[PDB]
Amino acid sequence: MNLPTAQEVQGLMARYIELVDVGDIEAIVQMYADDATVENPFGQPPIHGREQIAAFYRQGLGGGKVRACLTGPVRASHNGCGAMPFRVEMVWNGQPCALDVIDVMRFDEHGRIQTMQAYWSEVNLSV
Amino acid sequence: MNLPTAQEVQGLMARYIELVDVGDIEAIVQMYADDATVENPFGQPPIHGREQIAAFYRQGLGGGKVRACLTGPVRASHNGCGAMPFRVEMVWNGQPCALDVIDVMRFDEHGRIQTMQAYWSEVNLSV
Ligand SMILES: O=[N+]([O-])c1ccc(O)cc1F
Numbered sequence: 232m233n234l235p236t237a238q239e240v241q242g243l244m245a246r247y248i249e250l251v252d253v254g255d256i257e258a259i260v261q262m263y264a265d266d267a268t269v270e271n272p273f274g275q276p277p278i279h280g281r282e283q284i285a286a287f288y289r290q291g292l293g294g295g296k297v298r299a300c301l302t303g304p305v306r307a308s309h310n311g312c313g314a315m316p317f318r319v320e321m322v323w324n325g326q327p328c329a330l331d332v333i334d335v336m337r338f339d340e341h342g343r344i345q346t347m348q349a350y351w352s353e354v355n356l357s358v
Numbered sequence: 359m360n361l362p363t364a365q366e367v368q369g370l371m372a373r374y375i376e377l378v379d380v381g382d383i384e385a386i387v388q389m390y391a392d393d394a395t396v397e398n399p400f401g402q403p404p405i406h407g408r409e410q411i412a413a414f415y416r417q418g419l420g421g422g423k424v425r426a427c428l429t430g431p432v433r434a435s436h437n438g439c440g441a442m443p444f445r446v447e448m449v450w451n452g453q454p455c456a457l458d459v460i461d462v463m464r465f466d467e468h469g470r471i472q473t474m475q476a477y478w479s480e481v482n483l484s485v
């Protein structure tokens with residue numbers, strides 16, 4: 232891939248959510264640039280690089296069942312960026328919660344995620 | 359208002375949509391900082407300041423039948439930012455159409471919008 236087109240961004244971002252839903256940590260990490268950053272939630276310091284990003288996804292998706300689904304269409308740009316709304320369902324203390332999130336991503340000139348920013352706060356959690 | 363809290367961001371960003379929906383250009387412009395920027399769509403160069411911003415809203419809201427509604431919750435941060443998904447219904451050449459958008463906003467230390475970025479492309483328009 233080169234810089235993804237708007238259409239390619241929609242496909243990549245939807246792919247990403249599919250990978251989160253099934254919980255394929257290694258497949259998620261490979262979507263990222265080797266030196267990518269993740270800010271989760273937006274407002275917290277970034278994490279840097281695939282090792283730290285893999286640890287992030289392992290922490291969240293490693294154990295119990297997690298589901299994730301788009302809750303509206305991906306909004307893509309013509310500069311390799313996009314934003315998408317989704318919901319993550321998880322068990323927290325035997326307690327089924329849901330978290331509503333919007334991710335903003337920028338992709339590099341190879342089609343990998345260079346930056347991810349996850350907008351949400353505790354008000355977006357529901358038990 | 360100081361830097362808005364996550365709850366305050368949710369209220370402001372929801373109010374913004376209510377004002378787009380009712381078509382109140384002056385009330386929208388008043389929500390922006392005097393030297394704010396708007397990037398619409400994200401990927402295009404920013405416009406700057408209340409005069410340019412007012413001209414943007416007036417193009418669309420002055421006389422057109424326009425409705426706008428959140429299509430999911432506002433995702434707020436603890437650093438005065440947020441992101442929200444919504445749909446704008448408008449009329450184009452006598453055709454009803456809908457545009458799916460995500461706005462990302464950063465508010466200043468006075469509770470006014472410092473930056474707005476509207477993610478969407480042609481793939482988000484339905485005629
Ligand atoms: O559950 N999260 O905090 C979460 C945040 C952003 C993501 O892109 C995926 C996720 F699972």
Ligand SMILES: O=[N+]([O-])c1ccc(O)cc1F
Binds near residue numbers: 457459461476
């Ligand atoms: O129709 N738009 O392009 C549009 C974009 C962003 C907005 O905050 C409002 C709008 F009506």
